[PDB]
């Protein structure tokens, strides 16, 4: 009687336990599908998207390297690419062609350093494209290097004229724009194919031809042999500007120092008036305002500022706190069930 | 021996002085510019980007070759 | 008897339940290891990869921002970098140096607006690189701005000649290419250092020198004083083209209009023949075909088209179905298991 | 009795298993939160971070496309952007403007291939910017195309003079730098607006004017009609260089072959001495060293080498071995539970 | 009919020869360069990059437009 | 003045007219171009990229400095 009710009590109590394990077991299968679904999403939609981002980023790195190379080529060989017939070469391309230094450029070309300044300023070095290969994408340039010969003792003089007054009459002397001297000898000079520079004149053709005996006496002191023009019904120039010094014919006209306001009065004995930049930076001659001094403007600076942001900082996932509790609970029942199993 | 003193009494002045150098037979050199750099990988991630660069090169280089062929 | 086998009936059933719980308990550690394995893959493989991608992408953003700056430097200061000795400045570099506008440029330089047009077209502004610093990567440009003085009342005239014909004899008058007039006065003009432009001539050196009395009469009407050349055994030009109007000496030769086909006959009283581009766009003179009309070609457009692609957009992982199902199937048995103890 | 102890031990054993299951249930709760925490991390800090990475890379792709397009525009239309008043056009811009080929350029413009060589080398084609639209970022470029007329039968000759000796006296003949011939006719030539080239001179203005009867006799053979210049107290040039041939007046001076060391003797029968670039590459005349031969330097190559790196390789996650282990053990408990029910 | 034999006995030599071509009335064409390419996406991922390119264009184009107005 | 009617009867024509302006002492200004922009972060990500830009700068700037030192 007592046991029979107890057997029924164990019958009902054990009945729910079998159902209890079934429910948690099927819930366990739900976890497996959940974890598998996480794995599928990572493998099928994160890894392919990660690799596509990595593949696209490699292409952008190469495209920037290739564009930086072309910009360097455009920087150095720009004029040659646009003008394949005849274009000046860069100082960067000249350095590269002859070794890798300007000292190698001067030694190989036999330039004095002041010869390179004359050649660079006159644009004497030309590059011509002689072959373009559109299959392997290269071009061949043909650079021509000028060769200079200096005639010792020859000095080139540039002449500039101005009208002068002797009494009430205005005269003008006709002289060549350029003359050349070699010691005591004087010759004419043709500037058609020449570049006049402080270091020296570089002429692509000949410029020297002899001078007539009459013009030689003019330049040597006998000014009465010089050809003069009376300015009657015509006009010339009344001032010259030369390296910040003004040479003017202030006779029978009004010359005024515009800065100080004083009248520049010419001594009758003297022929021409010389005005320096410091004494008068701005001068009025015959109503014409002339700037003798050089104005300086405040310095300017070209700048750029780049502001960027640090990349993202993804921390650790850190889900071990929940895993540890489940591990602790799993071990709790692991020993609890085994110890109770010994009773059986 | 130009008399620069006597010559300024008649309005003539000298505003420069330089040496004289005349150009002579020129030298020559050939420079080869490789516009396409040497890429070693050449993966599938760089196929499109290399083609875009070649199109840029043809925009510049092709008119030069055509002009050289026609004018020579 | 019956209770004895009843105890065994519970004994056989209960012992299997302990084994049943043991199986799912070890399967629980299988889930934990899988979840831990997922976390390790994320922390050790995906997080380092995104940070590497982010670090690489930040470098490419700077590189593109930093190459775009150079392309701006090359765009504005290109000719100066290639030719440090002497190079013209760009219109963009001129505005930056003098304030930030052309209006500031005109007032600081004292230009009239038509003076800037003359200076820009003659390339009068030059920049020289005076200092290069390689440690801190900057250069210093020295810019020289011309100052212009206008001689008020002086007008420069360009002369062009053609071989006129009187009777059956062809002549040619020798005149200077350029002359200058100041009211009623006429002088000579030297174009060596000058740039002839519609607004005005900008001369780096002096150009005005007086004219002889004999040539003054020739230009003032007394054409008998002009120096004339009989062209016998020689040849000159027989037509001039000027601003779409053709001046030709059609005497003794065959002039015809190529377009209409008519023959241009010169009246004996008239010396020269004037042909306008409207009446005849193409003219043949002495067998030479002259294009006096202006041809226009169809407009061309340079343009580019860029096509992009929408960025990827990964959706939500969405594993809450199986995970939510397990939650329902987990704590449903929480009360079911607890119910067993209550009846006990 | 005996069953009472057996039932009590069974009741105690069953009671422990109830605590055993509940511990497993709470461990199951930890797994759900751990899996949910993993899913939350992916949707909160991985998907948003990757989309930002993808969004950033799309902008970088367009920026590189845009910069490459500008570098193409700067490559073609560079000089026009910096010089909006008057700049030469590139060969790439000329090809695009008139069709898309140089053959279409030649036919549309009426050039002959050698006409384009003389126009490209003289820089006759100029572009002017006539409209800038900053609202929509385009510029209108106006291009002027020269039209050429050839005077048939006219040939331009360049004359270069040198001094010569008659016994012990040095003379110099004055001739124009340029002359022109048409069959048997000879005329003068003005090189002010011309560009001397092997294919033909292109003059922007007229260059032909008649020659005096006295100078015609000089050029036709009667050399006694030419104007001479005794070189006394002056000096000229004693050598000419003409494309690898040296014409020198080695009379009364010392000329030697710098290469071979020999002395170049001037035979009195001949007036001038001709030296070829092969017989003597370097020549000294009157102490002046002249380079007659053409030096050649070793070829140079400009090239770049780019080394890349393979993208990251994220492999399969591969955590299915632990999931499969739990699946197998869950299946065992599913079967084992049914067996226990049969006993009960 | 220049006699180059007699003329070289007096130091005169000819160092060139060419034809003669004189420039007549010039032709004209208009070329429109569109510096902003036509982009079809215009998403939120490209707003900043398009503005950076526009600022580059204003650096170059604006001094040209402002100088044309002043000089004309 | 010039009698343009009479000069046309002898083949002389006037094909232009302009004012006369002569150049005087020039002004001067110094412009400093900083080719390396001021970058603030300078972290470990932006190390190889800045070095590659500096290598580009040396390709351009170094020949200029060497030529300036040699010619001056
Ligand atoms: C220079 O001028 C002075 C006085 O004007 C004169 O006596 C002299 O002969 C001239 N010539 C020379 C060479 O001194
Ligand atoms: C450079 O390119 C050529 C042809 O493209 C190839 O043969 C060569 O191997 C490359 N250089 C190196 C170092 O691999
Ligand atoms: C690379 O591209 C080629 C050409 O389409 C293709 O055949 C090959 O399978 C690709 N390789 C990989 C690893 O995707
Ligand atoms: C111009 O010619 C006309 C008629 O021949 C006459 O006035 C005179 O000869 C000339 N004019 C002058 C001002 O000499
Ligand atoms: C060239 O000189 C020779 C000999 O002096 C002779 O034929 C004649 O004088 C000259 N020729 C001509 C065509 O004048
Ligand atoms: C730009 O592209 C769009 C879309 O293709 C289309 O309207 C046309 O091709 C262009 N439109 C304009 C206004 O440039
Ligand atoms: C795009 O940007 C605009 C302007 O900030 C904003 O209104 C819009 O919501 C954005 N679109 C998306 C999809 O974020
Ligand atoms: C760059 O910016 C920083 C900001 O901290 C400043 O201190 C530094 O002087 C700047 N460098 C320059 C302007 O060269
Ligand atoms: C780069 O520098 C950062 C500090 O900004 C440091 O954390 C990191 O370890 C460095 N990496 C290397 C490879 O030196």
From Swiss-Prot, chains A, C, D:
Effect of residue 209 to A: Greatly reduced fusion function. No effect on F0 processing
Extracellular side: 1-344
Effect the entry attributes to changing residue 253 to S: Greatly reduced fusion function. Inefficient F0 processing
Spans annotated as HRB: 305-344
Region of interest (Interaction with hemagglutinin), residue spans: 227-304
Disulfide bonds: 194-203, 218-226, 250-255, 257-280
Coiled-coil intervals, chain numbering: 1-26, 322-344
Mutation effect (residue 122 to R): Hyperfusogenic
Phenotype upon changing residue 220 to A: Greatly reduced fusion function. No effect on F0 processing
Region (HRA): 1-75
Name recorded for this polypeptide: Fusion glycoprotein F1
Covered range of the whole protein: 141 to 484 of 550
């Amino acid at each position: 009687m007592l046991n029979s009710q107890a057997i029924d009590n164990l019958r009902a109590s054990l009945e729910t336990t079998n159902q209890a394990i079934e429910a948690i077991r099927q819930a366990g299968q739900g976890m497996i599908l959940a974890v598998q679904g996480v794995q599928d999403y990572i493998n099928n939609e994160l890894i392919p998207s990660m690799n596509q981002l990595s593949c696209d980023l490699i292409g952008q790195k190469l495209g920037l390297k290739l564009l930086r190379y072309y910009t360097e080529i455009l920087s150095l060989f720009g004029p040659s690419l646009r003008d394949p017939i005849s274009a000046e070469i860069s100082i960067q391309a000249l350095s590269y062609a002859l070794g890798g230094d300007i000292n190698k450029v001067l030694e190989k070309l036999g330039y004095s350093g002041g010869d390179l300044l004359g050649i660079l300023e006159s644009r004497g070095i030309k590059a011509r494209i002689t072959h373009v290969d559109t299959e392997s994408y290269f071009i061949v340039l043909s650079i021509a290097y000028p060769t200079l010969s200096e005639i010792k003792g020859v000095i080139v003089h540039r002449l500039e004229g101005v009208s002068y007054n002797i009494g009430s009459q205005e005269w003008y002397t006709t002289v060549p724009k350029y003359v050349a001297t070699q010691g005591y000898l004087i010759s004419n000079f043709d500037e058609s194919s020449c570049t006049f520079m402080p270091e020296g004149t570089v002429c692509s053709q000949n410029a020297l031809y002899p001078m007539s005996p009459l013009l030689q006496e003019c330049l040597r002191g006998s000014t009465k042999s010089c050809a003069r023009t009376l300015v009657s019904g015509s006009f010339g120039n009344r001032f010259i500007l030369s390296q910040g010094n003004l040479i003017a014919n202030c006779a029978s006209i009004l010359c005024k120092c515009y800065t100080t306001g004083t009248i520049i009065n010419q001594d009758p004995d003297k022929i021409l008036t010389y005005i320096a930049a410091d004494h008068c930076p701005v001068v009025e001659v015959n109503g014409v305002t002339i700037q003798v001094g050089s104005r300086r403007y405040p310095d300017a600076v070209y700048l750029h500022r780049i502001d960027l942001g640090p990349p993202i900082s993804l921390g650790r996932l850190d889900v071990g706190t929940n895993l540890g509790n489940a591990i602790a609970k799993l071990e709790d029942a692991k020993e609890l069930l085994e110890s109770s199993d010994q009773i059986l | 021996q130009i008399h620069w003193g006597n010559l300024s009494k008649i309005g003539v002045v000298g505003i420069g002085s330089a040496s004289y150098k005349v150009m002579t037979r020129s030298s020559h050199q050939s420079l080869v510019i490789k516009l396409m750099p040497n890429i070693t990988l050449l993966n599938n991630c760089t196929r499109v980007e290399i083609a875009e660069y070649r199109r840029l090169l043809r925009t510049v280089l092709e008119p030069i070759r055509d002009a050289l062929n026609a004018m020579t």
